[PDB]
Amino acid sequence: SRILLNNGAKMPILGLGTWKSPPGQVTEAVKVAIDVGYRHIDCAHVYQNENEVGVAIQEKLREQVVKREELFIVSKLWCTYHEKGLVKGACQKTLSDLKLDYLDLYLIHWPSGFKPGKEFFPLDESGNVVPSDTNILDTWAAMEELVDEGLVKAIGISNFNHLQVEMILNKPGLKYKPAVNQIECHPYLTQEKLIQYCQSKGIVVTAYSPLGSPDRPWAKPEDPSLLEDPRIKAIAAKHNKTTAQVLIRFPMQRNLVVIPKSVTPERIAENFKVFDFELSSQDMTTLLSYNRNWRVCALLSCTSHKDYPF
Ligand SMILES: NC(=O)c1ccc[n+]([C@@H]2O[C@H](COP(=O)([O-])OP(=O)(O)OC[C@H]3O[C@@H](n4cnc5c(N)ncnc54)[C@H](OP(=O)(O)O)[C@@H]3O)[C@@H](O)[C@H]2O)c1
Ligand SMILES: O=C(O)COc1cc(F)ccc1C(=S)NCc1ccc(Br)cc1F
Numbered sequence: 001s002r003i004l005l006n007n008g009a010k011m012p013i014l015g016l017g018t019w020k021s022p023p024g025q026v027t028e029a030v031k032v033a034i035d036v037g038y039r040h041i042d043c044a045h046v047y048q049n050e051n052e053v054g055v056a057i058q059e060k061l062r063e064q065v066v067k068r069e070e071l072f073i074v075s076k077l078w079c080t081y082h083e084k085g086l087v088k089g090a091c092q093k094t095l096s097d098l099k100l101d102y103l104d105l106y107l108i109h110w111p112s113g114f115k116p117g118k119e120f121f122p123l124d125e126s127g128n129v130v131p132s133d134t135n136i137l138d139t140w141a142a143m144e145e146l147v148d149e150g151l152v153k154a155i156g157i158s159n160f161n162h163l164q165v166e167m168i169l170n171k172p173g174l175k176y177k178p179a180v181n182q183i184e185c186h187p188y189l190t191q192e193k194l195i196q197y198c199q200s201k202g203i204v205v206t207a208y209s210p211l212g213s214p215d216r217p218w219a220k221p222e223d224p225s226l227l228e229d230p231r232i233k234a235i236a237a238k239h240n241k242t243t244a245q246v247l248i249r250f251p252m253q254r255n256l257v258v259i260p261k262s263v264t265p266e267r268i269a270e271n272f273k274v275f276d277f278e279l280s281s282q283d284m285t286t287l288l289s290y291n292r293n294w295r296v297c298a299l300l301s302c303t304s305h306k307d308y309p310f
Protein backbone atom coordinates (compact mmCIF):
# COMPACT_ATOMS: atom_id res chain seq x y z
CA SER A 1 0.00 0.00 0.00
CA ARG A 2 2.88 2.54 0.35
CA ILE A 3 6.00 3.35 -1.67
CA LEU A 4 9.26 4.48 -0.13
CA LEU A 5 10.38 7.99 -1.04
CA ASN A 6 13.92 9.25 -1.28
CA ASN A 7 13.36 11.24 1.90
CA GLY A 8 12.91 7.96 3.86
CA ALA A 9 9.15 8.35 4.34
CA LYS A 10 6.41 6.10 2.95
CA MET A 11 3.69 7.41 0.67
CA PRO A 12 0.30 5.71 0.11
CA ILE A 13 0.07 4.73 -3.56
CA LEU A 14 -3.64 5.61 -3.65
CA GLY A 15 -4.88 9.07 -2.76
CA LEU A 16 -7.97 11.21 -3.19
CA GLY A 17 -7.90 14.04 -5.72
CA THR A 18 -9.67 17.31 -4.90
CA TRP A 19 -9.49 19.54 -8.01
CA LYS A 20 -13.09 20.58 -8.92
CA SER A 21 -14.52 19.05 -5.75
CA PRO A 22 -17.13 21.64 -4.79
CA PRO A 23 -16.51 23.33 -1.45
CA GLY A 24 -19.98 22.22 -0.32
CA GLN A 25 -19.19 18.56 -1.15
CA VAL A 26 -15.50 18.05 -0.49
CA THR A 27 -15.70 17.98 3.32
CA GLU A 28 -18.01 14.97 3.16
CA ALA A 29 -15.94 13.43 0.33
CA VAL A 30 -12.74 13.57 2.43
CA LYS A 31 -14.56 12.29 5.56
CA VAL A 32 -15.93 9.36 3.56
CA ALA A 33 -12.53 8.69 1.97
CA ILE A 34 -10.80 8.48 5.37
CA ASP A 35 -13.56 6.30 6.76
CA VAL A 36 -13.20 3.81 3.91
CA GLY A 37 -9.39 3.68 4.03
CA TYR A 38 -7.79 6.52 2.17
CA ARG A 39 -4.75 7.91 3.89
CA HIS A 40 -3.46 10.31 1.17
CA ILE A 41 -5.25 13.50 0.02
CA ASP A 42 -3.99 15.57 -2.93
CA CYS A 43 -4.66 19.29 -2.49
CA ALA A 44 -3.67 22.66 -3.93
CA HIS A 45 -4.18 26.30 -3.00
CA VAL A 46 -5.35 27.05 -6.57
CA TYR A 47 -8.25 24.57 -6.17
CA GLN A 48 -9.83 27.10 -3.71
CA ASN A 49 -11.15 24.35 -1.38
CA GLU A 50 -8.32 23.66 1.05
CA ASN A 51 -10.31 25.12 3.96
CA GLU A 52 -13.10 22.62 3.41
CA VAL A 53 -10.63 19.74 2.91
CA GLY A 54 -9.07 20.81 6.18
CA VAL A 55 -12.35 20.72 8.07
CA ALA A 56 -12.64 17.02 7.10
CA ILE A 57 -9.04 16.12 8.01
CA GLN A 58 -9.32 17.90 11.32
CA GLU A 59 -12.62 16.25 12.22
CA LYS A 60 -11.22 12.80 11.51
CA LEU A 61 -8.13 13.57 13.61
CA ARG A 62 -10.37 14.88 16.42
CA GLU A 63 -12.64 11.83 16.24
CA GLN A 64 -9.48 9.64 16.37
CA VAL A 65 -10.46 7.80 13.20
CA VAL A 66 -6.82 8.22 12.17
CA LYS A 67 -3.54 9.57 13.63
CA ARG A 68 -1.77 12.45 11.93
CA GLU A 69 1.25 10.20 11.34
CA GLU A 70 -0.97 7.83 9.34
CA LEU A 71 -2.08 10.58 6.90
CA PHE A 72 -0.11 11.77 3.88
CA ILE A 73 -1.25 15.24 2.92
CA VAL A 74 0.04 16.83 -0.28
CA SER A 75 -0.33 20.41 -1.49
CA LYS A 76 1.25 22.59 -4.10
CA LEU A 77 2.82 26.07 -4.45
CA TRP A 78 0.85 28.12 -6.99
CA CYS A 79 2.67 29.91 -9.87
CA THR A 80 2.07 33.41 -8.49
CA TYR A 81 4.16 32.55 -5.41
CA HIS A 82 7.48 31.70 -7.09
CA GLU A 83 9.30 34.46 -5.40
CA LYS A 84 11.81 33.91 -2.55
CA GLY A 85 9.81 36.16 -0.25
CA LEU A 86 6.39 34.59 -0.95
CA VAL A 87 6.98 30.80 -0.76
CA LYS A 88 6.88 30.46 3.03
CA GLY A 89 3.68 32.49 3.32
CA ALA A 90 2.04 30.47 0.55
CA CYS A 91 2.93 27.25 2.39
CA GLN A 92 1.73 28.67 5.68
CA LYS A 93 -1.63 29.70 4.20
CA THR A 94 -2.12 26.15 2.91
CA LEU A 95 -1.17 24.78 6.34
CA SER A 96 -3.62 27.17 8.01
CA ASP A 97 -6.44 26.18 5.69
CA LEU A 98 -5.74 22.46 5.98
CA LYS A 99 -5.54 22.74 9.78
CA LEU A 100 -2.07 21.20 9.76
CA ASP A 101 1.32 21.96 11.31
CA TYR A 102 3.20 20.21 8.48
CA LEU A 103 2.63 18.81 4.98
CA ASP A 104 3.90 15.36 4.06
CA LEU A 105 4.71 16.64 0.57
CA TYR A 106 4.75 20.09 -1.02
CA LEU A 107 5.10 20.42 -4.76
CA ILE A 108 6.00 23.18 -7.20
CA HIS A 109 2.64 23.03 -8.99
CA TRP A 110 3.91 24.12 -12.43
CA PRO A 111 7.46 25.01 -13.46
CA SER A 112 6.39 28.46 -14.63
CA GLY A 113 6.26 31.44 -12.27
CA PHE A 114 3.70 34.21 -12.82
CA LYS A 115 3.54 37.83 -11.65
CA PRO A 116 2.43 37.90 -7.98
CA GLY A 117 -0.88 39.44 -7.06
CA LYS A 118 -4.51 38.48 -6.41
CA GLU A 119 -5.11 36.86 -9.77
CA PHE A 120 -3.97 33.27 -10.22
CA PHE A 121 -3.49 33.83 -13.97
CA PRO A 122 -2.36 37.44 -14.44
CA LEU A 123 -2.80 38.30 -18.12
CA ASP A 124 -1.56 41.03 -20.37
CA GLU A 125 -4.05 42.90 -22.53
CA SER A 126 -3.69 40.30 -25.30
CA GLY A 127 -4.35 37.28 -23.03
CA ASN A 128 -0.83 35.98 -22.47
CA VAL A 129 0.14 35.05 -18.93
CA VAL A 130 2.48 37.55 -17.34
CA PRO A 131 5.67 35.76 -16.20
CA SER A 132 7.80 36.15 -13.16
CA ASP A 133 11.61 36.33 -13.77
CA THR A 134 12.19 33.78 -11.07
CA ASN A 135 13.69 30.53 -12.25
CA ILE A 136 13.07 26.90 -11.24
CA LEU A 137 16.36 26.70 -9.30
CA ASP A 138 15.70 29.64 -7.00
CA THR A 139 12.18 28.36 -6.42
CA TRP A 140 13.66 24.99 -5.51
CA ALA A 141 16.01 26.62 -2.98
CA ALA A 142 12.98 28.22 -1.39
CA MET A 143 11.30 24.81 -1.22
CA GLU A 144 14.38 23.37 0.50
CA GLU A 145 14.09 26.02 3.21
CA LEU A 146 10.57 24.74 4.05
CA VAL A 147 12.05 21.32 4.84
CA ASP A 148 14.65 22.95 7.06
CA GLU A 149 11.97 24.95 8.92
CA GLY A 150 9.85 21.88 9.55
CA LEU A 151 6.83 23.04 7.53
CA VAL A 152 7.07 20.14 5.08
CA LYS A 153 8.50 16.58 5.30
CA ALA A 154 9.21 16.22 1.57
CA ILE A 155 9.36 18.51 -1.46
CA GLY A 156 8.75 17.74 -5.14
CA ILE A 157 7.69 18.98 -8.51
CA SER A 158 4.70 18.70 -10.84
CA ASN A 159 4.39 19.01 -14.60
CA PHE A 160 8.17 19.15 -14.97
CA ASN A 161 9.50 17.81 -18.23
CA HIS A 162 12.68 15.77 -18.56
CA LEU A 163 14.95 18.72 -19.01
CA GLN A 164 13.38 20.57 -16.06
CA VAL A 165 13.80 17.56 -13.77
CA GLU A 166 17.39 17.34 -14.95
CA MET A 167 17.87 21.06 -14.22
CA ILE A 168 16.89 20.49 -10.58
CA LEU A 169 19.01 17.33 -10.30
CA ASN A 170 21.97 19.27 -11.66
CA LYS A 171 21.38 22.32 -9.47
CA PRO A 172 24.60 23.65 -7.94
CA GLY A 173 24.49 23.03 -4.22
CA LEU A 174 21.34 20.87 -4.41
CA LYS A 175 20.36 20.01 -0.82
CA TYR A 176 17.21 17.87 -1.24
CA LYS A 177 16.33 15.98 -4.38
CA PRO A 178 12.70 16.11 -5.47
CA ALA A 179 10.86 13.19 -3.95
CA VAL A 180 8.01 13.16 -6.46
CA ASN A 181 7.14 14.43 -9.92
CA GLN A 182 3.32 14.56 -10.28
CA ILE A 183 2.30 14.38 -13.95
CA GLU A 184 -0.73 13.57 -16.07
CA CYS A 185 -0.75 9.85 -16.84
CA HIS A 186 -3.39 7.47 -18.19
CA PRO A 187 -3.76 5.03 -21.16
CA TYR A 188 -4.05 7.91 -23.63
CA LEU A 189 -0.88 9.64 -22.25
CA THR A 190 1.29 6.84 -20.96
CA GLN A 191 4.43 8.87 -20.32
CA GLU A 192 6.90 5.99 -20.72
CA LYS A 193 9.89 8.25 -21.38
CA LEU A 194 9.46 10.69 -18.50
CA ILE A 195 8.46 7.94 -16.07
CA GLN A 196 11.53 5.85 -16.88
CA TYR A 197 13.74 8.97 -16.46
CA CYS A 198 12.26 9.92 -13.09
CA GLN A 199 12.24 6.37 -11.78
CA SER A 200 15.86 5.90 -12.78
CA LYS A 201 16.69 8.90 -10.64
CA GLY A 202 14.74 7.57 -7.64
CA ILE A 203 11.93 10.12 -8.06
CA VAL A 204 8.47 8.63 -7.46
CA VAL A 205 5.89 9.54 -10.10
CA THR A 206 2.31 10.39 -9.20
CA ALA A 207 -0.29 9.95 -11.99
CA TYR A 208 -2.92 12.65 -12.06
CA SER A 209 -6.14 12.64 -14.11
CA PRO A 210 -5.99 8.82 -14.19
CA LEU A 211 -9.61 8.59 -15.36
CA GLY A 212 -9.10 11.24 -18.05
CA SER A 213 -10.64 14.07 -16.00
CA PRO A 214 -14.11 13.85 -17.55
CA ASP A 215 -15.21 16.89 -15.43
CA ARG A 216 -12.37 19.12 -16.67
CA PRO A 217 -14.04 22.44 -17.50
CA TRP A 218 -12.75 22.54 -21.07
CA ALA A 219 -14.03 19.07 -22.03
CA LYS A 220 -15.57 18.86 -25.48
CA PRO A 221 -18.14 16.28 -26.61
CA GLU A 222 -15.80 14.95 -29.30
CA ASP A 223 -12.98 14.22 -26.91
CA PRO A 224 -11.71 10.70 -26.19
CA SER A 225 -13.32 9.05 -23.08
CA LEU A 226 -11.28 6.51 -21.11
CA LEU A 227 -14.16 5.51 -18.99
CA GLU A 228 -16.26 4.71 -22.05
CA ASP A 229 -13.49 2.98 -24.08
CA PRO A 230 -14.91 -0.46 -24.93
CA ARG A 231 -11.42 -1.99 -24.94
CA ILE A 232 -10.85 -0.90 -21.35
CA LYS A 233 -14.37 -1.98 -20.48
CA ALA A 234 -13.53 -5.45 -21.79
CA ILE A 235 -10.45 -5.73 -19.56
CA ALA A 236 -12.59 -4.61 -16.61
CA ALA A 237 -15.26 -7.18 -17.39
CA LYS A 238 -12.71 -9.96 -17.58
CA HIS A 239 -11.60 -9.11 -14.04
CA ASN A 240 -15.20 -8.44 -12.78
CA LYS A 241 -14.08 -4.88 -11.87
CA THR A 242 -15.22 -1.45 -13.06
CA THR A 243 -13.43 0.51 -15.74
CA ALA A 244 -12.37 3.07 -13.12
CA GLN A 245 -10.87 0.28 -11.00
CA VAL A 246 -8.80 -0.92 -13.98
CA LEU A 247 -7.68 2.69 -14.68
CA ILE A 248 -6.57 3.04 -11.03
CA ARG A 249 -4.83 -0.34 -10.80
CA PHE A 250 -2.91 0.34 -14.05
CA PRO A 251 -0.58 3.04 -12.68
CA MET A 252 -0.22 1.14 -9.38
CA GLN A 253 1.37 -1.74 -11.27
CA ARG A 254 3.81 0.69 -12.95
CA ASN A 255 5.08 1.64 -9.45
CA LEU A 256 3.23 4.95 -9.67
CA VAL A 257 1.13 6.72 -7.05
CA VAL A 258 -2.40 7.53 -8.32
CA ILE A 259 -4.90 10.17 -7.20
CA PRO A 260 -8.39 9.68 -8.68
CA LYS A 261 -10.89 12.42 -7.80
CA SER A 262 -14.47 11.88 -6.75
CA VAL A 263 -17.12 13.59 -4.64
CA THR A 264 -19.54 10.65 -5.04
CA PRO A 265 -19.44 8.47 -1.88
CA GLU A 266 -20.09 5.24 -3.71
CA ARG A 267 -17.32 5.96 -6.17
CA ILE A 268 -14.88 7.01 -3.47
CA ALA A 269 -15.38 3.60 -1.94
CA GLU A 270 -15.29 1.73 -5.28
CA ASN A 271 -12.08 3.45 -6.30
CA PHE A 272 -10.36 2.18 -3.16
CA LYS A 273 -11.16 -1.46 -3.88
CA VAL A 274 -8.15 -2.02 -6.08
CA PHE A 275 -5.76 -3.97 -3.87
CA ASP A 276 -7.43 -7.37 -4.45
CA PHE A 277 -6.85 -8.05 -8.16
CA GLU A 278 -3.96 -8.02 -10.61
CA LEU A 279 -3.75 -6.97 -14.23
CA SER A 280 -1.61 -9.37 -16.25
CA SER A 281 1.52 -8.23 -18.08
CA GLN A 282 -0.46 -8.61 -21.31
CA ASP A 283 -3.25 -6.42 -19.87
CA MET A 284 -0.62 -3.83 -18.87
CA THR A 285 1.02 -3.82 -22.32
CA THR A 286 -2.39 -3.65 -24.00
CA LEU A 287 -3.34 -0.59 -21.89
CA LEU A 288 -0.02 1.03 -22.72
CA SER A 289 -0.76 0.48 -26.40
CA TYR A 290 -3.67 2.98 -26.21
CA ASN A 291 -1.28 5.94 -25.90
CA ARG A 292 -2.25 8.82 -28.21
CA ASN A 293 -0.24 11.65 -26.51
CA TRP A 294 -3.60 13.12 -25.52
CA ARG A 295 -3.19 15.68 -22.79
CA VAL A 296 -6.13 16.99 -20.86
CA CYS A 297 -4.06 19.43 -18.81
CA ALA A 298 -2.56 22.12 -21.02
CA LEU A 299 -3.34 25.82 -21.35
CA LEU A 300 -2.97 28.08 -24.29
CA SER A 301 -2.56 31.30 -22.33
CA CYS A 302 0.68 29.94 -20.77
CA THR A 303 2.30 28.37 -23.83
CA SER A 304 4.70 31.27 -24.45
CA HIS A 305 6.05 31.27 -20.91
CA LYS A 306 9.77 30.35 -21.03
CA ASP A 307 9.19 27.39 -18.68
CA TYR A 308 5.93 26.05 -20.12
CA PRO A 309 6.64 22.32 -19.99
CA PHE A 310 4.88 20.86 -23.01
N1 LIG B 1 -0.55 18.57 -10.51
C1 LIG B 1 -1.41 19.10 -11.37
O1 LIG B 1 -1.14 19.93 -12.23
C2 LIG B 1 -2.75 18.39 -11.47
C3 LIG B 1 -3.57 18.55 -12.61
C4 LIG B 1 -4.81 17.84 -12.70
C5 LIG B 1 -5.18 17.00 -11.64
N2 LIG B 1 -4.35 16.92 -10.48
C6 LIG B 1 -4.79 16.12 -9.25
O2 LIG B 1 -5.25 14.87 -9.75
C7 LIG B 1 -6.63 14.61 -9.32
C8 LIG B 1 -7.30 13.63 -10.27
O3 LIG B 1 -7.42 14.25 -11.60
P1 LIG B 1 -8.75 14.94 -12.14
O4 LIG B 1 -9.56 15.56 -11.05
O5 LIG B 1 -8.31 15.83 -13.25
O6 LIG B 1 -9.62 13.77 -12.83
P2 LIG B 1 -9.84 12.18 -12.65
O7 LIG B 1 -9.52 11.77 -11.31
O8 LIG B 1 -9.18 11.55 -13.83
O9 LIG B 1 -11.42 12.11 -12.96
C9 LIG B 1 -12.33 12.75 -12.02
C10 LIG B 1 -13.71 12.53 -12.67
O10 LIG B 1 -14.00 11.13 -12.70
C11 LIG B 1 -15.25 10.85 -12.11
N3 LIG B 1 -15.15 9.58 -11.46
C12 LIG B 1 -14.40 9.24 -10.33
N4 LIG B 1 -14.52 7.98 -9.99
C13 LIG B 1 -15.39 7.45 -10.93
C14 LIG B 1 -15.85 6.15 -11.03
N5 LIG B 1 -15.54 5.12 -10.21
N6 LIG B 1 -16.70 5.93 -12.10
C15 LIG B 1 -17.08 6.95 -12.97
N7 LIG B 1 -16.60 8.23 -12.85
C16 LIG B 1 -15.74 8.45 -11.81
C17 LIG B 1 -15.44 11.98 -11.09
O11 LIG B 1 -16.84 12.18 -10.88
P3 LIG B 1 -17.48 12.57 -9.45
O12 LIG B 1 -16.49 13.40 -8.68
O13 LIG B 1 -18.77 13.31 -9.87
O14 LIG B 1 -17.81 11.23 -8.76
C18 LIG B 1 -14.86 13.18 -11.88
O15 LIG B 1 -15.80 13.71 -12.80
C19 LIG B 1 -7.19 16.06 -9.22
O16 LIG B 1 -8.42 16.15 -8.54
C20 LIG B 1 -6.01 16.75 -8.55
O17 LIG B 1 -6.01 16.39 -7.16
C21 LIG B 1 -3.15 17.57 -10.39
O1 LIG C 1 -3.34 22.71 -12.57
C1 LIG C 1 -4.11 21.82 -11.98
O2 LIG C 1 -3.79 21.22 -10.95
C2 LIG C 1 -5.45 21.50 -12.59
O3 LIG C 1 -5.83 22.56 -13.49
C3 LIG C 1 -6.23 23.78 -12.94
C4 LIG C 1 -6.81 23.91 -11.69
C5 LIG C 1 -7.19 25.18 -11.28
F1 LIG C 1 -7.74 25.27 -10.07
C6 LIG C 1 -7.01 26.32 -12.06
C7 LIG C 1 -6.42 26.17 -13.34
C8 LIG C 1 -6.03 24.91 -13.73
C9 LIG C 1 -5.38 24.72 -15.06
S1 LIG C 1 -5.96 25.67 -16.28
N1 LIG C 1 -4.26 24.02 -15.20
C10 LIG C 1 -3.54 23.95 -16.46
C11 LIG C 1 -2.23 24.72 -16.43
C12 LIG C 1 -1.87 25.64 -15.43
C13 LIG C 1 -0.64 26.28 -15.48
C14 LIG C 1 0.27 26.01 -16.50
BR1 LIG C 1 1.94 26.82 -16.59
C15 LIG C 1 -0.09 25.11 -17.50
C16 LIG C 1 -1.31 24.47 -17.47
F2 LIG C 1 -1.63 23.61 -18.43
Ligand SMILES: [Br-]
Nearest residue numbers: 110111112308
Ligand atom coordinates in the same frame (compact mmCIF):
# COMPACT_ATOMS: atom_id res chain seq x y z
BR1 LIG D 1 3.76 25.92 -16.71
